[PDB]
Design a protein around this ligand. Sequence first.
Ligand SMILES: *Cc1c(COP(=O)(O)O)cnc(C)c1O
Ligand SMILES: *Cc1c(COP(=O)(O)O)cnc(C)c1O
Ligand SMILES: *Cc1c(COP(=O)(O)O)cnc(C)c1O
Ligand SMILES: *Cc1c(COP(=O)(O)O)cnc(C)c1O
Lengths: 329, 331, 335, 329
Amino acid sequence: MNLQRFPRYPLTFGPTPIQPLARLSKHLGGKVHLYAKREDCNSGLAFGGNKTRKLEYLIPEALAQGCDTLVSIGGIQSNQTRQVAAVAAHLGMKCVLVQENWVNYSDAVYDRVGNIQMSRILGADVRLVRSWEDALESVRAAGGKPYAIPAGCSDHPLGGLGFVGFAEEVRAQEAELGFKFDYVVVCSVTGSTQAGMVVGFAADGRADRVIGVDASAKPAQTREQITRIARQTAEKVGLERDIMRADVVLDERFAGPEYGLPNEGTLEAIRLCARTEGMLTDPVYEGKSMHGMIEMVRNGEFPEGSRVLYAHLGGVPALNGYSFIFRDG
Amino acid sequence: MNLQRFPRYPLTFGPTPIQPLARLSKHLGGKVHLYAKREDCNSGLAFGGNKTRKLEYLIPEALAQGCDTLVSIGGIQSNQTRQVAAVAAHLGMKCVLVQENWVNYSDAVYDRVGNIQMSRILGADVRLVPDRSWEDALESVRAAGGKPYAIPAGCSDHPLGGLGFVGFAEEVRAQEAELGFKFDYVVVCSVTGSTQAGMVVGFAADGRADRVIGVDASAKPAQTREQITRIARQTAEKVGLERDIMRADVVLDERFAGPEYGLPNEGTLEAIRLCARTEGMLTDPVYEGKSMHGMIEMVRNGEFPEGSRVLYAHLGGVPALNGYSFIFRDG
Amino acid sequence: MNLQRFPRYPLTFGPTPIQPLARLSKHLGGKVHLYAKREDCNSGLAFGGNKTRKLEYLIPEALAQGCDTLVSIGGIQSNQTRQVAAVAAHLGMKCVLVQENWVNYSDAVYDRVGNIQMSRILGADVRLVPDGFDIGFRRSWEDALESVRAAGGKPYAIPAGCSDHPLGGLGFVGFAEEVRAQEAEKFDYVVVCSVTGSTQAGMVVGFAADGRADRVIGVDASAKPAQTREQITRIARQTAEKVGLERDIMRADVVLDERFAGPEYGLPNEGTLEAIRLCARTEGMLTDPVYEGKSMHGMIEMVRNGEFPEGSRVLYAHLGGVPALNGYSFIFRDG
Amino acid sequence: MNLQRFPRYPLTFGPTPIQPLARLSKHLGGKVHLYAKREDCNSGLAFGGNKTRKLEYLIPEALAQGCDTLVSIGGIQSNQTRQVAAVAAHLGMKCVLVQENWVNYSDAVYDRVGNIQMSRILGADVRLVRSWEDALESVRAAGGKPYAIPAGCSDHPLGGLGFVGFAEEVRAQEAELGFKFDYVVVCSVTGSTQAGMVVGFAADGRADRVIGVDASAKPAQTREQITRIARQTAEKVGLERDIMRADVVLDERFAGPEYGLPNEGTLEAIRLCARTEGMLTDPVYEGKSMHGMIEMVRNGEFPEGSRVLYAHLGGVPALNGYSFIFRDG
Ligand SMILES: *Cc1c(COP(=O)(O)O)cnc(C)c1O
Ligand SMILES: *Cc1c(COP(=O)(O)O)cnc(C)c1O
Ligand SMILES: *Cc1c(COP(=O)(O)O)cnc(C)c1O
Ligand SMILES: *Cc1c(COP(=O)(O)O)cnc(C)c1O
């Protein structure tokens, strides 16, 4: 394959570090070696995260197209939209965000802290709710040229490129470390994060080692999205193989009870990981993927000796919209 | 000098990047070149920030002395205590935090979002003073069978609390080497003081101590200024500074600290917005927004020599934004 | 029957007013006439409400016993504990409230606004436990009673909602009495929200006396109808006997509709919300997402479905609870 | 005088009750007998309060004029705008409310709980920010006829009538009681509440017995508004005398530090009163007037044996916007 053909606009500090999770690994049995690749610390643009890695491959097209406004969408505590707002500010672009009520969660400061708060400070036009088209049209009619960024950046032709690059990065780091990771655990919702990974790791025969953990609570849709995006992306980068259902692993046991709502396992997972490693995760995405990984290790689902690379996608600021749940820890 | 004599426990990713703030520089007239060194992105331990750089030089002693608990203190939205809680969890140590109402602010979720929320999740025993806390805290640890390592407010008034930022100057020299030039100034927010102190000592070396432009955020200029001065002299001695720190070496502008510690003024808010909107870089209403406000005003007043290169030290503090949600409800 | 036998301490202004809900009645077609008996406005003690009417019959006992502390229990936005705190302060008694989140809900300011905020201002010792403590399991209720004694005082034990208490059903028997006296100026049905039960129970006993027990249409807000229904019946029978009601309470006398309790105790459904908004926008009368909004939703839905004979006059008992709206601010952010 | 010349629209349950504050009185030495007149429990329309007594005299005119929309104004936690929204709903009229932040305060849920929450639920169109004028115009432009209701109902020709009636009510109740109150404590900010009282008690020679307690923190301006409204109202009811400045008593010692902000004395008084009587007061209005009365009795400013009638004007729902302050009581 060949990713290098597509330009990448630097929005990150560079390759993201991989850290050992020795305390947590030991706590769980010392049988499985856990690591974490910090996508959550990839940028100076309002905390970045996985969405920011994706955006690097989309910005060039926005610039090439002479666009002046970035328009995106997501739930109230969307990480995607907060990142688009920061990238836009940094690029000197206007920003219009469509924020919808995507979660059955009632919290007094939900639309005023965390991710959405930053987007407003960053100068984005935050619209709280077809709304998609309206917003875009709004921009054209306003005299500007919008660059449409779908939810999570996922269902877009360039949306899968960022994480194919992730697999690339990991290969280079395994070469520096002198060892390979047996698996990768990643949280999945809109899909192009895992899709990129699947294509990237299909290259060296480990697509099936990319263990996705669903956090959408609609596993069938998410799995089809990932699969579809992986196929389109595999074509885009010249993978010399088709993606098979066997290449898309999506665990469904940890997404409940709903998207945006933690279960008690989620909370326990967030607490354990934070208290053993000092590494925070959130109740919507990462805490669920962290939950899955801990559970898998606990159930012995990982062969003894396995090295598991947890991909920390970001999302911590959303913790602010769930303050009551953590009031005592 | 020789900071190398003191061990440094790795708590950061490595040197912190310097980024140009061209959009903001141009916005202010394009006469002064603004940069930012990102201490606020130095670690994977609950966002880190300047305190985490300070802590790298304290943990070895704490470990050497066999302590099993880190004990610290600060206001409700203290960045310090949150970093202590994360560093403790990472090191396998317990943590006790004494949090006091240091600000005349009373937001509905002030004690449940941002920094303090993270400390609780990180497993610290977060103690809210009513409404000697410090001694009870330390003693409770002994009484329980542990050994506490005491970390004073901001890590500042501690024998080792000024080291972290001497190394910051060391870091900046090596980056200037690749940059092919030296920054004319450094802007840093100051409250407990060992951050600006370390910098004062670090830059005294190549005679730029008075180029480190401190911006007071304590709203108690005199005390803070005095503490920086003292911490500097002590640290200077600790590292072998072949020169002495003169009062003239400690620079602290007091025009941007109002109205009180922990409360922003309208300038602070505008500054936070201007910078976030021109660079995608956030600052808080208690600390960085005030030093950012200082720098912009300085540039605006033509107080920087045309052509000057100014290095803004972004110390962190962003999670505290969550405690001032009403002020930013519309931006 | 004779309630006059049991002493009643004044904690209310006097009988509660009945007002017509003419606008809401008209909006629903005008075929049924709705009114409201404002139990929610019965007292100067921190907004009072139904619980305060119940307390009038318990306090004489607490006083005769020489108790100096009132001890009660309830969820975070419990109306009962807030009224106990004000009654206590008013009487010069101390107050301990054992509390815990009894709802699968987690609003940012849930434990610091509305009802619980007032209890703390009122001087009560609000003992709110962290999630997973489980007071009902550890029997924290008793330790609290014990700690008062252990401390030198004498506690008067007031159970959840005052209901499952010997004198807990008297207040609302008196309500039926008061209604009769006001009718001497008759309502066909009464709509009342039911959770812990002695409110509707007292009504059942009180109205059984003039043959209207089955005219009290209870609307479950517990989302545990079977338990609640049984509680109402039992409290009724005990209270009937207590007030010498020369009659047995039939299973037929206790009416508890289960259609508007969803999805859970303390959680409103879209129906609850529309009902709160409709009643508020037509009569200027506010109801809450936990209790009254569900019974308001009940009455409106019943009238809408024609379960009420044309021409019927329905007396909606507004038991109170409005302060709890403060804990559901996000839901009403745009109205 | 002749108050009866004006039509009063019923919006209350009827005369408000007078309760003794026996415990608070004994607590402060029992040398002064304190009582409370509960204007705060005067209506089933969203808790009511003094504003509702004022409004009973303005509504007939709004109706007579055929207006279909009530338009008013106040700060975020304004009690007035909440009562206006409830009266509108009850009357079947539309409601437009201009809310501005009149307080240097910024609590996270300030514009979502208490009074303003009720107004939105009651169906008012709550517009947060020439303010006033724009609102009024927009209603006409929509094809409606708005009835303008100034802040607190105070600078309105009819705004002072409600409390002239309050004095009426009190003489009548004093008859039944068989005794007279020597003083009346009342919180004053916009002014027509105390002005109505001044006029109503001028009739029996007790105008200077109406002890006003400033809560505006701008006493000179408030003292002048009460004076003016009182004179204009006395003329409108045919008082057989002109109102003199000496008829207006306004203590300025308890308004600090600013309108909308409590001082430590305010909080203490709110707590003492709540804990001795079970009667709540707020940090903006009543707690300051409660603070005043207690301080007056404590300093021996009332003659031994005096009977003081505290007018509790309402305002308790605003407590919700000061939750941090009362988190532990
Ligand atoms: C968007 C997001 C995810 C899921 O990534 P997808 O590419 O949408 O599947 C996981 N974690 C965080 C923190 C995210 O913002
Ligand atoms: C502690 C802190 C400061 C001030 O540093 P001192 O060493 O205490 O002077 C500035 N900004 C942030 C974000 C901080 O946490
Ligand atoms: C307690 C309560 C109810 C239910 O009354 P029970 O006697 O417990 O059945 C209804 N509404 C409100 C406002 C309440 O506080
Ligand atoms: C408006 C108000 C006041 C002050 O009354 P004015 O007539 O404006 O002086 C006092 N208390 C409460 C509760 C109020 O709403």
